[PDB]
Amino acid sequence: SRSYPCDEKKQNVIAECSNRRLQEVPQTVGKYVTELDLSDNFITHITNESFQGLQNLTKINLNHNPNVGLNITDGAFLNLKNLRELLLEDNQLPQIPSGLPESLTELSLIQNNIYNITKEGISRLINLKNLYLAWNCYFNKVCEKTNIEDGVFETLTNLELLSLSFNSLSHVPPKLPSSLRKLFLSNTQIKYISEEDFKGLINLTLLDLSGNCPRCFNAPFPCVPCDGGASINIDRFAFQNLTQLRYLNLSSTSLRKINAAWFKNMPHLKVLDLEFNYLVGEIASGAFLTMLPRLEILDLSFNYIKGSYPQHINISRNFSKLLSLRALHLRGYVFQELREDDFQPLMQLPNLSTINLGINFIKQIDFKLFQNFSNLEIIYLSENRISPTDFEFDPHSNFYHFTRPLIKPQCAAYGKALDLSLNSIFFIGPNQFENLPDIACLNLSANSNAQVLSGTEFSAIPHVKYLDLTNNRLDFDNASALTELSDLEVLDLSYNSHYFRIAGVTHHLEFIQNFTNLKVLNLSHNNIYTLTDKYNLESKSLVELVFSGNRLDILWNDDDNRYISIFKGLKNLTRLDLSLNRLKHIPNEAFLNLPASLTELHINDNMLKFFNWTLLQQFPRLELLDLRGNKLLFLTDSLSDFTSSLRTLLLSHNRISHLPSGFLSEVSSLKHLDLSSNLLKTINKSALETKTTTKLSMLELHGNPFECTCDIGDFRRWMDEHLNVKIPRLVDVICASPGDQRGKSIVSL
Amino acid sequence: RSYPCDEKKQVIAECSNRRLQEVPQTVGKYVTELDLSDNFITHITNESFQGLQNLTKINLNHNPNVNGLNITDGAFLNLKNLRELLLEDNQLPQIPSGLPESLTELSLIQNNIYNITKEGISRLINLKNLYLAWNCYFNKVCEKTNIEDGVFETLTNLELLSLSFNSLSHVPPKLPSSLRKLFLSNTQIKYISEEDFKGLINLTLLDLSGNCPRCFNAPFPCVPCDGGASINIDRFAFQNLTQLRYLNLSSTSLRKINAAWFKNMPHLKVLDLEFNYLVGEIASGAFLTMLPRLEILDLSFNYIKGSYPQHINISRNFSKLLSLRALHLRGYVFQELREDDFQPLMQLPNLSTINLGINFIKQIDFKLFQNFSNLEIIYLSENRISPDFEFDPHSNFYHFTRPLIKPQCAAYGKALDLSLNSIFFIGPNQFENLPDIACLNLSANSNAQVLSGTEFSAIPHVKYLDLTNNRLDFDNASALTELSDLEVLDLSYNSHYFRIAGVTHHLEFIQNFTNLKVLNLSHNNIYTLTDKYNLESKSLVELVFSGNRLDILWNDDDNRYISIFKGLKNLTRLDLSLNRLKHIPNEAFLNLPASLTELHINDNMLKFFNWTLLQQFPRLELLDLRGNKLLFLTDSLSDFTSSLRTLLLSHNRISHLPSGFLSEVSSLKHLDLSSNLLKTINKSALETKTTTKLSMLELHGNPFECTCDIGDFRRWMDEHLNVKIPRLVDVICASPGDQRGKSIVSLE
Ligand SMILES: *[C@@H]1O[C@H](CO)[C@@H](O[C@@H]2O[C@H](CO)[C@@H](O[C@@H]3O[C@H](CO)[C@@H](O)[C@H](O[C@H]4O[C@H](CO)[C@@H](O)[C@H](O)[C@@H]4O)[C@@H]3O)[C@H](O)[C@H]2NC(C)=O)[C@H](O)[C@H]1NC(C)=O
Ligand SMILES: *[C@@H]1O[C@H](CO)[C@@H](O[C@@H]2O[C@H](CO)[C@@H](O[C@@H]3O[C@H](CO)[C@@H](O)[C@H](O[C@H]4O[C@H](CO)[C@@H](O)[C@H](O)[C@@H]4O)[C@@H]3O)[C@H](O)[C@H]2NC(C)=O)[C@H](O)[C@H]1NC(C)=O
Ligand SMILES: *[C@@H]1O[C@H](CO)[C@@H](O[C@@H]2O[C@H](CO)[C@@H](O[C@@H]3O[C@H](CO)[C@@H](O)[C@H](O[C@H]4O[C@H](CO)[C@@H](O)[C@H](O)[C@@H]4O)[C@@H]3O)[C@H](O)[C@H]2NC(C)=O)[C@H](O)[C@H]1NC(C)=O
Ligand SMILES: *[C@@H]1O[C@H](CO)[C@@H](O[C@@H]2O[C@H](CO)[C@@H](O[C@@H]3O[C@H](CO)[C@@H](O)[C@H](O)[C@@H]3O)[C@H](O)[C@H]2NC(C)=O)[C@H](O)[C@H]1NC(C)=O
Ligand SMILES: *[C@@H]1O[C@H](CO)[C@@H](O[C@@H]2O[C@H](CO)[C@@H](O)[C@H](O)[C@H]2NC(C)=O)[C@H](O)[C@H]1NC(C)=O
Ligand SMILES: *[C@@H]1O[C@H](CO)[C@@H](O[C@@H]2O[C@H](CO)[C@@H](O)[C@H](O)[C@H]2NC(C)=O)[C@H](O)[C@H]1NC(C)=O
Ligand SMILES: CCCCCn1cc(-c2ccccc2)nc1N
Ligand SMILES: CCCCCn1cc(-c2ccccc2)nc1N
Ligand SMILES: *[C@@H]1O[C@H](CO)[C@@H](O)[C@H](O)[C@H]1NC(C)=O
Ligand SMILES: *[C@@H]1O[C@H](CO)[C@@H](O)[C@H](O)[C@H]1NC(C)=O
Ligand SMILES: *[C@@H]1O[C@H](CO)[C@@H](O)[C@H](O)[C@H]1NC(C)=O
Ligand SMILES: *[C@@H]1O[C@H](CO)[C@@H](O)[C@H](O)[C@H]1NC(C)=O
Ligand SMILES: *[C@@H]1O[C@H](CO)[C@@H](O)[C@H](O)[C@H]1NC(C)=O
Ligand SMILES: *[C@@H]1O[C@H](CO)[C@@H](O)[C@H](O)[C@H]1NC(C)=O
Ligand SMILES: *[C@@H]1O[C@H](CO)[C@@H](O)[C@H](O)[C@H]1NC(C)=O
C-alpha cells in the first residue's frame, strides 16, 4: 500500500521516519522493516511495547528525541531479537539503559549525560563491535568526572572500536579487550601514557590521544592546559607492541619533543596527526622523521610560535626519508618567504602529491621550486599574503581541521592545481606566473582583483581548463580578456558585481565567443544589468550558463529591445539558470529567443505572476522546467498541447489554487510534478482524468491548505489506486479545515 | 476611526497602496488632501468624489496597480477648490477632458499622451506646474509628440513646464514668459534657435540634457545626432535668459562651449556638463572667465574612450571661477595627480568640494591639498591608490543626488574618502602631508593588515573612521589607539579573519578611547576571541553587534563570554539582531549593561524570552524582539519594568494575549503585535482598573476570527480612539470564510 507515517522502501527494507513531529513510536510501521530511523521526532518515552510487532528490526535510530529527556524503561529493547545497531545520541540520557539485547553489535550513546560506565549496562553485550560514548562531559558542561567500572570492557571480546573522547577520564582505562582496532581518547584529560596502558592491544590500527595537555592559546573552546602548559607524557615503551598501527593522532598535546623510538615498531604508520603542538624545533631537526617509511599523510598544521614570524620555513633534511609521503600539511607555521632551497628535502619524494601551505602569511614565493617535483597535483596556498545541533562541534567530524577536499574535485580532475585564493593579488603582473608548471586548475578567488584582463596575464600557464575568479572586482573593459586560455572549459566569475553595478564604467563580455571548448560559465551574483557595445552572449561550445543574481528585470525591461536576444547565440546550451533576477514578467519575444537546444531551465525565486505556457512549443528538448518561488496564480489547461518532452516541472512556492481538468495524465512525458507549498484546497476528480500511463511517478503536495471534507475523497481514492505515484512527506500533506481535521494528514480520516 | 484611509490634520487622507478597486465612498468629508496612489482603481467619474467638495489635492498615481485608468469627461470638474492633481503611471491615452479651471499643479508623467492640445490645457489658466515627461522615450512603442501651436500661450501663470523624455524635435513656440523652469531633456532637439527662448526673462532653470546624446556605453537605448554631432545652439539662444541659475547640458555631445552663451547670464550658479566630450575645453576653457558667480560645476564622465592620460590638464582659467564651491571631475580617467595640475584651483576662496571619483588614479601627491584655502570634502573613491520602469522620473538621470560623504561623518570636519581603492595595507608614510582630517573613509580597500597604533599618527585627530568591507587582522591590542579623539568607528564586514578559528582576534583596543561613542561590529561573523573575552569602554554609547555568532559565544557548554558586554558601562543602545540566537542564558542576559535604553534582538530564532529579567533594566525604553519564534508573553509585566515605552513583537508566534496586557504597563506607548497568530482578543485581555496610555497598537497580519465575539475588542477600539491602529485594511479576518479577506472593522 502507501506507508504512513514513515516513507518505507527496500534495499537488497528501510523506514525513514525522521523529523516528522512524532509524539511516540508510531504503531503503523511495516512488518518486514529492517532499519527504522526515528531521529529528530518528539518522542518522550520508550517501553517494551513501543516496538512490539517488529522483531525483524536490525537497526533503530532514535537520535535527537525529543528535539526543538528521553525515558527508556529497562528491557524496552530486550525483545528485539535481531537488533544489531542502536543509535541513542543526543537524548539527555542519565545512565546507560539497562537490559539492552545481547544481539547489539553497534551502540552509539554520543552527546548524552552519562558519567558512570558500568557492567550492569555494558558487560552483557559480548557481541559489541563498535561502542561510541563520546561527548557526555566536556568543556564547561555541568557534569561529573567519568567513572569506568573496573574491567567493564574486558567481556567485550569482539570490541573493535571504542570512543570515549570528550569525557573526563584522567587515565586510560585498564582492561581493554585485545580485539580493539580503534581507540579514541581525545580530550579526556589524560596527562600520562604508561607502558601498561596499551601493552595488550596488538591489533590496534588507530590510536587518538589528541587534546590531552592541549595547547590552549586561542582555543575556540574552553581550554584547560596541563600544569605550566606541559607536554602530554608518553612513556618510552608505550607504543612498543602497537605493530599494526596505521593512524596516530597526537594533535594538541603540547609536544615539543618527539621520541623517535616511539615509532620503532610501527613501520606501517600511514597517518600521523601532529597539529597544534610546539614542533617548530622538531620540524627543523627531528629524528622521528627517519622512522616513518610508510607514512602517507603528515599533518603539522598550527605549530606556529606565538608572536614569531621567521623569514623562512626550516625543514629538516630528514623529510627526505618519508618515501611514501602523499600529502604534507604545514598550515599555520607562519613565515614570510618561500625559497627553492627551503624545500630540497621534499623534491625527491616520488609520491608527494599534496602540499598544503594555507594560513602562513606568506608574502613572497619562488614559484620555480614547484617545477623540481616528482608529481605534485595539488599546490594549496590559500590564505596567505601574496601580492603583485545545539552543540557547536559535530561529534562525527574531525575536531582539529575541516575534512573536505582542498580544491573542488571538478577542478582538480583536469590536472595540476594551484590555489592562490584569499591572498592579496589585486593585480596580475606580467611575471606573476613565470616558472610555474603546467597548471590545469587555478584558483584566484577572493584576491580583490580589480584589473582589466586583456589576453596576456595567463600566457605563462596557457593550458588552464578550470579557472575560478570568484569574489573579485574585475573590470571587464577589454574584449580579449582570457582569450589566451584556449583550452578553457570551466570559467567561474561569480561575485564580481562591483563594477557591473556602475552604469558609467564599461562591461565587455565579448571574449566569451572566443573559446572553442568552453563548457560551463558561471556569471552568478554579478548584478549584470548593462553591457557595452555587444549586448549578446555567444558561444558555439557552451553547454551551461549560470546567470542567477543578475538583473534581467532591467535587461528585458519593456522600453528596451537591446537585450531581447541576449542568450540566443549560445547555440549548444542545454542548461540555463535565471533564478534570482527579480523578474515579474518575461517578454514573450525574450522567452522565444532562449536557445532551442535547452534541456534544463530554471527561473526559480523571481516574481513571476504569469507564465506563457504556449511558448514551450519552441523548446522540443526541454526536460526540466523550474518555476519555484514565484507568484504564479494559475496553470494552463493545455500543457499537453505545448510539450511532449517535459519530464520535471517544479512549481513549489507559488500561488496556485486550482489544478486544471485533465492536467495530471494528459501529458505523457511528465514523471515528476512538484506543487508543494501552493494554495490548493482540493484536487478535482476531473484533473485526475487518466490516460497513459499516467507516467507520473512523483507528485509533491506538502504545504497546501487542503479542505479535508468528503470533497477530497475523490483524490484519496485516486492515491489509494495509483500507488506507483510516490507522494513524499505524507505527514506534511496537511488539512487546513475544518477545525476538527486542522493539522492532520489528509490520509488519516 | 477613518476607513479605509488613515486620516489626520494640521486634513489629510493617506489611502495609498491599499488594494482598493473604487474610490472609497467613506472618506471623511472634511478631507482636503487625498492620496489614492497604488490602488486598483480602474474608473473615475463625476460620482467618485461626489461628497468631497473641499478637496485641494488628489493623488491617483499608478492606478490600477499591476488597460489603465478610465477617466470620464468632466469627472473632476465639480471639485471647485482642486489645486493639485497627480495622474502619473496610469496609461492615459490623452490628457483627460474637462479638468477643473482651479488646477495649479497637474502631473501626467509616465502615460501614453502624444497629443498636447488646447482642448486639454488651454483653459487651465491657473497652472503653475505642468509635468508631461516620460510619455514617449527609449524603445517604447509611441508616437512623436504633437504640440498644438499656442497651447501653452494662455498659461500666463505657468512657472514650471516639463516635457522631458518625449519626442519633440523642436522647442515649442509660444511659451509664456512667466516660465521659471523648463525641462526639455531627451526630447531629440538638435538645434536651439534664437527665437526658442527669446522672451523668457524669468527663467532660472533650463534643462537641455540628452539632446544629441553621447551614446557610448549608454544604460538606455540611445540615439545620437548624425555623426555624433553636438547639439547646435545659436550664438544668441540665451540673449534674454538673464535670470538663469541652473543650466543642464549633460550628454549633448559638446566639444566646444561658446563663451558668448553666458554674456548676459550673471547669476549662473550650477552648470552641468556631464557625459560630453570636453577634455579639450577643460584644458583651454574660454567659457570659464564668464562664470565668476558659478558655485557648482559638473564635468563628470568626459573621458576619451580608451585614453589613459598621465595627468589631468586643468586650464589656468579655472582660477576665474571665484565663487566655485564644488567641482566634479568623476570619470576623466588619468594616472597621476601632481601639485602643479591643481594650481588654478588653489586660490578659489570657497571651493569646499573636490570630486575625483572613478578616474583610475594611481598616484596622488597628497601635499597638494594643503595649498587649498578650505577644502571640506576630498572625494577620491573608486580610484587606484596603493601603499514598471527603470528610471525614477523624479530624480536626476545622469547621477545620484545623495551626499558624497555621509553627513554624520562630514559634520566632524575635513573629510577624505579613499574608499574602493587598493590600499591593501597602510604604509608608514601613507598619510603624511595631509590636512588635519577628521572624517576618513577606507571602506572596501581589501586592507588585511595588523593595525598596531602608528598607522594613523600623521592624521591623529580623525573622529569618524570607516573601515568597512575590509579584511582586517585583529592581532595587536594597540590598534587605532593613536586616535584619541575617535568618536565613531565602523568595522562592519571585516568577517574575513573573524571566521577563522585558528587566527587570533584581539578587540582589547576598544577600552583605550576616552571619547568613543559609536562602534559598529556588524556582519563580522564574530564567534571567538583571544585572551580577553570582554568588550569594555567607559565612553561607548552605541554598539552594533548584528550579524555575528552570539549563538556560539553564549552556547551552553562555554562560559567565557557570559559578560562580553558588561564592561560597556555607559551603553544605551545595543543591537543583537541576526546572531542566530535560539535562547539567551539568563546570566548572559542579566550581564547586559544596566544602563541600556534601547535593546534589539530582532531576527533571531528566540523561542523563549525571560521577561522577569527586565527588573535589572530600569532605563529600558525600547525592546525589539521582532522576527523570532516567541510563543507567549508573561502574566505580570508591570512587575518587571516601569520604563518600557516601545515593545516590538511583530513576526512571532504569539497566539494568546494575557489578561489586562493592553493596559498592564502604562509606560508603554507603542505595542506592535503585527504578524503573529492571534485569533481574537478575549474580554479578560481588556480588564483593567488603570487607564491605558497606549497610543499605537499594531495588529495587521493576525488571523482573526470574525465571529460575533470579536465584538468586545471592536467596542474597546470604539471606546479607545486615542489608540491608533494603523493599516486597518490589513487587520483581516481569517475566518469564517465569507468573512475572509475583510477588515475586522466590518460587519455585525
Ligand atoms: C584524530 O585523528 C584521527 C585519525 O584521522 C581521527 O579519526 C577519524 O575521525 C573521524 C571523525 O569521526 C572518523 O570519521 C567517521 O567515520 C565513519 C565510519 O565510516 C563515517 O560514517 C563518518 O561519516 C558520517 O558523519 C560525517 C560527519 O557528520 C558525515 O560527513 C557523513 O555524512 C556521515 O554520516 C565519519 O567520517 C574517521 O573515520 C576517523 N578515522 C579513522 C581512520 O577511523 C580523529 O577524529 C582525530 N581526533 C579528533 C578529535 O579530531
Ligand atoms: C539637469 O539639471 C537640473 C538642475 O540640476 C536638474 O533639475 C533637477 O531635477 C530634479 C529631478 O526632478 C529635481 O528634483 C526634484 O525636486 C522636487 C521639488 O523640490 C522634489 O519634489 C523631488 O523630490 C521628490 O522626489 C525624489 C525622487 O523620487 C524623492 O527622493 C523625494 O523624497 C521627493 O519625493 C526632487 O528632489 C530638482 O529640483 C531639479 N532642480 C531644480 C533646481 O529645479 C535636472 O534633473 C537635470 N536633468 C536630468 C535629466 O537629470
Ligand atoms: C554601523 O552602525 C552605525 C551606528 O548605528 C550606523 O550609523 C548610523 O546609521 C543610522 C542609519 O540607520 C543613522 O541614523 C539615521 O540618521 C539620519 C540622519 O539625520 C536620520 O534621518 C535617520 O532617521 C530616519 O530614519 C530612521 C531609519 O533609518 C528612522 O528610525 C527615523 O525615525 C527616521 O525615519 C536615522 O536615524 C545614524 O546617524 C548613524 N550613526 C552614525 C554615527 O553615523 C552605520 O550606518 C552602520 N554601518 C553599516 C556599514 O551598516
Ligand atoms: C558556478 O556554477 C557552476 C556550474 O553550475 C558550479 O559548479 C557546479 O556545482 C554543482 C553544485 O552546485 C556541481 O554539481 C554537484 O556535483 C557533485 C559531484 O559529482 C554531485 O555529487 C552533486 O550532487 C552535484 O551534481 C557541479 O559538478 C559543479 N560544476 C562544475 C563544473 O564545477 C559552481 O559551484 C558555481 N560557483 C559558485 C561560486 O557558486
Ligand atoms: C577557491 O577558493 C575559494 C575560497 O577558499 C573556495 O571557496 C570555498 O568553497 C568551499 C567548498 O564548497 C565552501 O564550502 C567554502 O565555504 C568556500 N569558502 C569561501 C571563503 O568562499 C573555492 O571553492 C575554491 N575554488 C575551487 C575551484 O576549488
Ligand atoms: C565610505 O565609502 C563607501 C563606499 O563608497 C560608502 O558606502 C556606500 O554608502 C551609500 C550611502 O549610504 C550606499 O547607498 C551605498 O550602497 C554604499 N556602497 C557600498 C559599496 O557599500 C560609505 O557610506 C562611505 N562611508 C562614509 C562614512 O561616507
Ligand atoms: C596562524 C595564525 C597565527 C595567528 C597570529 N597572527 C599572526 C599574524 C601575522 C603574522 C605575520 C604577518 C602578518 C600577520 N596574524 C595573526 N592573526
Ligand atoms: C570612467 C569610465 C571609464 C570606462 C572605461 N574604463 C577605463 C578603465 C581603466 C582605465 C585606466 C586604468 C584602469 C582601468 N576601466 C574602464 N572600465
Ligand atoms: C607510490 O605510489 C604507488 C602507487 O599508488 C605505490 O605503488 C607505491 O607503494 C608508492 N611508492 C612508495 C615508495 O611508497
Ligand atoms: C575572438 O573572436 C572574434 C570573432 O569570432 C574575433 O573578432 C577576435 O579577433 C577574436 N580575438 C582573439 C582570438 O583574441
Ligand atoms: C556541444 O557540446 C558538446 C558537449 O556537450 C561538445 O562535445 C561539442 O563540441 C559542443 N559543440 C561545439 C560546436 O563546440
Ligand atoms: C504567448 O506569446 C505570444 C507571443 O509570442 C502571444 O501572441 C500570446 O498572446 C501569448 N500568450 C499569453 C497567455 O500571453
Ligand atoms: C568665501 O570665502 C571667503 C574667504 O575665505 C569668506 O570671506 C566668505 O565669507 C565666503 N563666502 C561664502 C559664500 O561662503
Ligand atoms: C557617557 O556617555 C555620554 C553620552 O555621550 C557622554 O556625555 C559622557 O561623557 C560619557 N562618558 C564618558 C565620555 O566617559
Ligand atoms: C527566568 O529568570 C529567572 C532568574 O534567572 C529564572 O530563575 C527563571 O526560572 C527564568 N524563567 C524561565 C521561564 O525559565
Question: Residues A263, A288: contact at Cβ < 8 Å?
Answer: yes
DSSP string, B188-244: ---EE-SSTTTT-TT--EEE-TTSS---TT-SS---PPGGGPPPEE-TTTTTT-TT-
Residue nearest to atom 5 of ligand 13 (CA): B349
- The Cα B155–Cα B177 span in angstroms is 9
Using alpha carbons, select from A742, A745, A682, A743 the residue that is nearest to residue A718.
A682
Residue nearest to atom 9 of ligand 9 (CA): A324
- The Cα A150–Cα B421 span in angstroms is 67
Residues of chain A with C-beta less than 8 angstroms from the C-beta of B422? 426-427, 448, 450
- The Cα A263–Cα A283 span in angstroms is 16
Distance to chain A for B223, nearest Cα, Å: 12
Q: Is B137 on the interface with A (CB under 8 A)?
A: yes
Nearest CA in chain A to B449: A385
Check pocket membership of B613 for ligand 15, CB cut-off 6 A.
Answer: yes
Residue nearest to atom 3 of ligand 12 (CA): A588
Report which secondary-structure segment, H or E, holds B248: strand B246-248
Q: Residues 557..586 of B with a Cβ closer than 8 Å to A: which?
A: 557-560, 582
Report which secondary-structure segment, H or E, holds A122: helix A119-122
Rounded-to-5 percentages of helix, strand, coil across chain A: 10, 15, 75
Question: Residues B328, B359: contact at Cβ < 8 Å?
Answer: no
Domain ranges, ordered by start, for chain B: 1-748
Residue A683: count other Cβ atoms within 10 Å of its Cβ: 24
Closest partner residue to B424 (CB to CB) among A424, A530, A554 is A424
Phi, psi of B417 (to 5 degrees): -120, 110
Using alpha carbons, select from B172, B194, B193, B191 the residue that is nearest to residue B183.
B172
Spell out the residues 6+ positions from residue B682 whose beta carbon is closer than 8 angstroms to its own. Answer: B657, B712
Closest partner residue to A139 (CB to CB) among B330, B500, B558 is B558
Residue A397: count other Cβ atoms within 10 Å of its Cβ: 10
Q: Are strands B129-131 and B488-490 parallel, antiparallel or unpaired?
A: unpaired
DSSP string, A655-690: ------TT-TTT-TT--EEE-TTS--S---GGGG--
Distance to chain A for B263, nearest Cα, Å: 33
Residues of chain B with C-beta less than 8 angstroms from the C-beta of A498? 420
**Largest Cα–Cα separation, chain A:** 84
Candidate of B379, B395, B468 to mutate for ligand 6, largest count of ligand atoms within 8 Å of Cβ: B468
Distance (Å) from CA A631 to ligand 12 centroid = 19
- All three cell numbers of B259, joined, read 563663451
CA A113 remoteness from chain centre:
29
DSSP string, A28-93: ---SS--EEE-TTS---EE-TTTTTT-TT--EEE--STT----EE-TTTTTT-TT--EEE--SS--
Using alpha carbons, select from B522, B533, B629, B636 the residue that is nearest to residue B578.
B522
Using alpha carbons, select from B355, B376, B380, B353 the residue that is nearest to residue B366.
B380
Check pocket membership of A514 for ligand 10, CB cut-off 6 A.
Answer: yes
- All three cell numbers of B546, joined, read 548584528
Residues of chain B with C-beta less than 8 angstroms from the C-beta of A384? none
Q: Which of B67, B139, B557, B560 to mutate to test the interface with A (most CBs of A within 10 A)?
A: B557
Distance (Å) from CA A400 to ligand 4 centroid = 27
CATH no. of B1-748: 3.80.10.10
Q: Is B605 on the interface with A (CB under 8 A)?
A: no
Q: What angle do CA B108, B114, B115 make, to 5 degrees?
A: 90
Distance to chain A for B552, nearest Cα, Å: 7
- All three cell numbers of B732, joined, read 483581516
Query: Could you tell me where the DSSP H helices lie in B227-343?
Result: 279-284
Residue A55: count other Cβ atoms within 10 Å of its Cβ: 12
Check pocket membership of A61 for ligand 1, CB cut-off 6 A.
Answer: no
Q: How many helices (H) and strands (E) does chain B have?
A: 7, 40
**Largest Cα–Cα separation, chain B:** 84
Phi, psi of B128 (to 5 degrees): -100, -40
Spell out the residues 6+ positions from residue A367 whose beta carbon is closer than 8 angstroms to its own. Answer: A433, A434, A435, A436
Q: Do B607 and A68 touch (CB under 8 A)?
A: yes
Instruction: Give all strands (DSSP E) within B658-737, no chain letters.
Output: 670-672, 696-698, 704-705, 733-735
CATH no. of A1-749: 3.80.10.10
Name the DSSP letter for residue A205: -
Residue written as cell 605550566?
A228
CA B646 remoteness from chain centre:
25
Using alpha carbons, select from B505, B517, B504, B580 the residue that is nearest to residue B544.
B517
Using alpha carbons, select from A291, A211, A290 the residue that is nearest to residue A250.
A211
CB burial of residue B17 (10 Å; 0-12, 13-18, 19+)? middle
Distance to chain A for B364, nearest Cα, Å: 19
Question: Residues A253, A211: contact at Cβ < 8 Å?
Answer: yes
Closest ligand by atom to B376 CA: 13
Question: Residues B510, B536: contact at Cβ < 8 Å?
Answer: yes
- All three cell numbers of A493, joined, read 566569475
Q: Do A609 and B66 touch (CB under 8 A)?
A: yes
Report which secondary-structure segment, H or E, holds A639: helix A639-642
CB burial of residue A431 (10 Å; 0-12, 13-18, 19+)? exposed
Using alpha carbons, select from A512, A511, A326, A490 the residue that is nearest to residue A414.
A490
Candidate of B245, B300, B392, B396 to mutate for ligand 2, largest count of ligand atoms within 8 Å of Cβ: B396
Distance (Å) from CA A220 to ligand 5 centroid = 22
Closest partner residue to A557 (CB to CB) among B390, B502, B531 is B390
Closest partner residue to A218 (CB to CB) among B219, B390, B530 is B530
Q: Would you call B535 helix, strand, or coil by DSSP?
A: coil
Q: Are strands A624-626 and A600-602 parallel, antiparallel or unpaired?
A: parallel
- The Cα A103–Cα A56 span in angstroms is 12
Distance (Å) from CA B440 to ligand 3 centroid = 18
In ligand 12, which atom is closest to the CA atom of A588? Answer: 5
Using alpha carbons, select from B466, B541, B474, B542 the residue that is nearest to residue B509.
B474
User: SS3 for A269-330, per residue?
Assistant: CCEEECCCCCCHHHHHHCHHHHHCCCCCEEECCCCCCCCCCCCECCCCHHHHHCCCCCEEEC
Q: Is A221 on the interface with B (CB under 8 A)?
A: yes
In ligand 12, which atom is closest to the CA atom of A592? Answer: 5
- The Cα B742–Cα B730 span in angstroms is 8
Strand partners, A570: A539
Question: Residues A698, A723: contact at Cβ < 8 Å?
Answer: no
Nearest CA in chain A to B581: A390
Nearest CA in chain A to B560: A222
Question: Residues A157, A180: contact at Cβ < 8 Å?
Answer: no
Q: Do A504 and B552 touch (CB under 8 A)?
A: no
Question: Residues B276, B249: contact at Cβ < 8 Å?
Answer: yes
| Alpha-carbon distances, residue A353 vs A317, A372, A434 (angstroms) | 19, 13, 21
Distance to chain A for B31, nearest Cα, Å: 36
In ligand 5, which atom is closest to the CA atom of A406? Answer: 28
Q: Would you call A699 helix, strand, or coil by DSSP?
A: strand
Strand partners, A184: A163, A208
DSSP string, B577-593: -SS--S---HHHHHTS-
Resolution as reported, in Å: 2.4
Q: Would you call B7 helix, strand, or coil by DSSP?
A: strand
Q: Do B358 and A222 touch (CB under 8 A)?
A: no
Residues of chain B with C-beta less than 8 angstroms from the C-beta of A562? 139, 221
Q: Is A411 on the interface with B (CB under 8 A)?
A: no
Residues of chain B with C-beta less than 8 angstroms from the C-beta of A383? 500
Closest partner residue to B557 (CB to CB) among A141, A302, A331 is A141
Check pocket membership of A186 for ligand 1, CB cut-off 6 A.
Answer: yes
| Alpha-carbon distances, residue A737 vs A22, A732, B563 (angstroms) | 21, 14, 49
- The Cα B668–Cα B675 span in angstroms is 20
